[PDB]
Design a protein around this ligand. Structure first.
Ligand SMILES: O=c1cc(CN2CCOCC2)c2ccc(O)cc2o1
Length: 268
């Protein structure tokens, strides 16, 4: 009750912009036992590219650091011109730092998407809305194929899909059902098989009857991204999650040799 609601930000339960009546601080207020203990360990997961969880109030409200804009809105605003490459690269690099950190602490996001990447005036981008109409566009193929015990690699896939979208100004795999998501992936990357993804034919939802599409060449997928970027993107979208690049290894990729921190032009 220590909080006056200002504005509904979104329905992920519901998220409000709110003011704390004892601190003055403006926050994002998410109104939602084993879980109370999990969630409470997440208040300790602190990094400059993760949105801070300030407080967990069970009387379940989660009180987050407030950021004014998300990458989805910023991409819609940048649509006539495109986000400049040095800013794409800066955002990619920052998200990979955030992920490497989460992943080193065995925390997976599980549901990365432009809507939950938050940006500020200083050029920072932050991971929000961690997962403990549903959009499937960023889901890794092992999740779509019914794997119950998936890994940190699911987040690298999501982020590769976002990287592609920043570059092209179009969603990479805009599926509207699980099967359409999967076939859209297959149409671009090729239907996977045991040669490229050992064990694939044993995933819970794999069907031998899936149609067999041939792989497209990547130069068609994210023009006009340079070879460094396309190389990193291909490694993030590797089918086999054991071969997909880690966040740590991606930070050493040649694509980042000239990374900088530009500031974006934001209308709040
Ligand atoms: O957990 C959250 C989720 C949101 C917004 N969601 C993202 C997904 O879509 C619904 C809207 C959020 C917004 C601003 C903020 O500062 C912190 C935040 O923390």
């Amino acid at each position: 009750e220590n909080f006056q609601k200002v504005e509904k930000i979104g329905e992920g339960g519901v998220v409000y912009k709110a003011r704390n009546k004892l601190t003055g601080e403006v926050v994002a207020l998410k109104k939602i036992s084993t879980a109370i203990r999990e969630i409470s360990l997440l208040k300790e997961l602190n990094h400059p590219n993760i949105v801070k969880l300030l407080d967990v109030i069970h009387t379940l409200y989660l009180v987050f650091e407030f950021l004014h804009q998300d990458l989805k809105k910023f991409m819609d605003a940048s649509a006539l011109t495109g986000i400049p490459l040095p800013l794409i690269k800066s955002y990619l690099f920052q998200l990979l730092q955030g992920l490497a950190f989460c992943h080193s602490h065995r925390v997976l996001h599980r549901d990365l998407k432009p809507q939950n990447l938050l940006i500020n005036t200083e050029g920072a981008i932050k991971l929000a809305d961690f997962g403990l109409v549903v959009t499937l566009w960023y889901r890794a193929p092992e999740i779509l194929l019914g794997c119950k015990y998936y890994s940190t690699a699911v987040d690298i896939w999501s982020l590769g899909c976002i990287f592609a979208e920043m570059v092209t100004r179009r969603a990479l795999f805009p599926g509207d059902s699980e099967i359409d998501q999967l076939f859209r992936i297959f149409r671009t990357l090729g239907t996977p098989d045991e040669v490229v993804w050992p064990g694939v034919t044993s995933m819970p939802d794999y069907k031998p009857s899936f149609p067999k599409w041939a792989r497209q060449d990547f130069s068609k997928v994210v023009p006009p991204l340079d070879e460094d970027g396309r190389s990193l993107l291909s490694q993030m979208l590797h089918y086999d999650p054991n071969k997909r690049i880690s966040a740590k290894a991606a930070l050493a990729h040649p694509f980042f040799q000239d990374v900088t921190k530009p500031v974006p032009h934001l209308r709040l």
